Design an enzyme around this catalytic site. Structure first.
Site, mmCIF file in Angstrom:
data_model
loop_
_atom_site.group_PDB
_atom_site.id
_atom_site.type_symbol
_atom_site.label_atom_id
_atom_site.label_comp_id
_atom_site.label_asym_id
_atom_site.label_seq_id
_atom_site.Cartn_x
_atom_site.Cartn_y
_atom_site.Cartn_z
ATOM 1 N N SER A 1 14.845 -13.075 -25.337
ATOM 2 C CA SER A 1 15.276 -11.869 -26.014
ATOM 3 C C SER A 1 16.308 -11.956 -27.136
ATOM 4 O O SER A 1 16.319 -11.117 -28.029
ATOM 5 C CB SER A 1 15.391 -10.648 -25.086
ATOM 6 N N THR B 1 21.199 -9.193 -25.365
ATOM 7 C CA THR B 1 20.977 -9.937 -24.130
ATOM 8 C C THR B 1 19.652 -10.696 -24.162
ATOM 9 O O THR B 1 18.782 -10.435 -25.006
ATOM 10 C CB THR B 1 20.937 -8.990 -22.904
ATOM 11 N N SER C 1 14.687 -4.310 -25.812
ATOM 12 C CA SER C 1 14.003 -5.615 -25.753
ATOM 13 C C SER C 1 12.493 -5.447 -25.589
ATOM 14 O O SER C 1 11.895 -6.033 -24.687
ATOM 15 C CB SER C 1 14.540 -6.493 -24.617
ATOM 16 N N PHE D 1 16.859 -12.868 -21.122
ATOM 17 C CA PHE D 1 16.559 -13.210 -19.731
ATOM 18 C C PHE D 1 15.170 -13.852 -19.680
ATOM 19 O O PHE D 1 14.165 -13.161 -19.786
ATOM 20 C CB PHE D 1 16.599 -11.938 -18.873
ATOM 21 N N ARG E 1 25.726 -11.734 -16.735
ATOM 22 C CA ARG E 1 25.637 -12.201 -18.121
ATOM 23 C C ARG E 1 26.527 -11.375 -19.049
ATOM 24 O O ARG E 1 26.857 -11.813 -20.148
ATOM 25 C CB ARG E 1 24.190 -12.197 -18.624
#
EC number: 3.5.2.6
Lengths: 240, 244
Positions: free
Chosen positions: B46, B185, B94, B187, B229
């Site tokens: 992402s 962010t 995202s 993942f 995170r």
């Protein structure tokens, strides 16, 4: 532009005289509580920081987005500020100096290009927007802000983008607000000052332009410049 | 780039294996909890939406900042993606399928060229034009993310200033008169216990007249640990006085 007198309810509880203009998608679809006041022109006060910042960047008086305005009766006027900081916090000397460096001829030229209110900058180059003859209506504020949103002002797209990020006041993944307050000072009952809140809201893939002003004759009523528009926007389903 | 061992204190509680890189003013003044991991390269996941967006704009695949990415009404992996999205919205939520289509339109040749210009990690886009940053061979380190983000902040990437500014506003996540945060962010997934996925949080903080660039990544094999995170880096930054 249509009139929605039902919005007067929000002003009445506080015995406030003012106007709200709200437009969905473009300035071709506007609504207001008071058609007459929507077109009446008032001192822009600090909402003038928007055109002033754009002009500052265009003329080169402001170098770029990262310029720092260093401090050489208000605490706020004694700290170093970024362009964004100068716009969002009280920074009278900063914009007074920007206006002086721009000068009356160039300032007049850009306000013509921007179709900014009555385009009357008499009253002193460093205070015409606060104590001078400059006046702008809520409708004109919406038209001006729409042009900025679309990058249609007579200025580089880069400079319009710079000023736009400086105006961001609320941020969520699918909700973004660009806004600016203004306040000419607390006046008296017979000779009130004016307070403003103008900007736009991007909610999902829609955009709403807004402009609010009210007469202010009581320091404690100042927060209404945000709460009244917020309540109207809530009732329109924009906030939730 | 000195090492701040005291920062490990924030990782010990959750038994997290990760790294935080924090730079004041520029990438020439950095600190981290783990020197070794700071330059270790991982799938961007992402976080790749940042360069992907810039490239989309540069190549004209994305028209301008007001382009709407319309939903076709067909099922997507996340309900949050089943709607029309702006460029900012697609980045903030995202929206993987939106950026996969952008990548396809950009194409391998142009993608490779731009990642070279951007000095983006190992610049390996093998694995499929729509999956190299998710499941492919692309790898980037925390240090590289900070260098890349600094360039973006300064409008120094090999792209128009207009396009860099557009993506910058799209990355705003926290706003106050004298406090502004731009962030993203990532993942990759939970992988396996033996080969765990990676989670990221990267961005920069403008506080008063100072700027701080940051990049965080950690190994993750359990989705429940994902919020770390943001919470680990936030706690470190707050401990350094970087707060609104």
């Amino acid at each position: 532009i249509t009139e929605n007198t039902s919005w007067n309810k929000e002003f009445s509880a506080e015995a406030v005289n003012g106007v709200f203009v709200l437009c969905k998608s473009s300035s071709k679809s506007c609504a207001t509580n008071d058609l007459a006041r929507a077109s009446k022109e008032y001192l822009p006060a600090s909402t003038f920081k928007i055109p002033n910042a754009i002009i500052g960047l265009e003329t080169g008086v402001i170098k770029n987005e990262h310029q720092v305005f260093k401090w050489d009766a208000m605490k706020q006027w004694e700290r170093d500020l970024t362009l964004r900081g100068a716009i969002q916090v009280s920074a009278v000397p900063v914009f007074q100096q920007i206006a002086r460096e721009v000068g009356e001829v160039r300032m007049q030229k850009y306000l013509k290009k921007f179709s900014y209110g009555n385009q009357n900058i008499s009253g002193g180059i460093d205070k015409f927007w606060l104590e001078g003859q400059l006046r702008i209506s809520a409708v004109n504020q919406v038209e001006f802000l729409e042009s900025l949103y679309l990058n249609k002002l007579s200025a580089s797209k880069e400079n319009q983008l710079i000023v736009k990020e400086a105006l961001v006041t609320e941020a969520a993944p699918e909700y973004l607000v660009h806004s600016k307050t203004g306040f000419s000072g607390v006046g008296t009952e017979s000779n009130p000052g004016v307070a403003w809140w103008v900007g736009w809201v991007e909610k999902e893939t829609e955009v709403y332009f807004f402009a609010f002003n009210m007469d202010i004759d009581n320091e404690s009523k100042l927060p209404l410049r945000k709460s009244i528009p917020t309540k109207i926007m809530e009732s329109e389903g924009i906030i939730g």
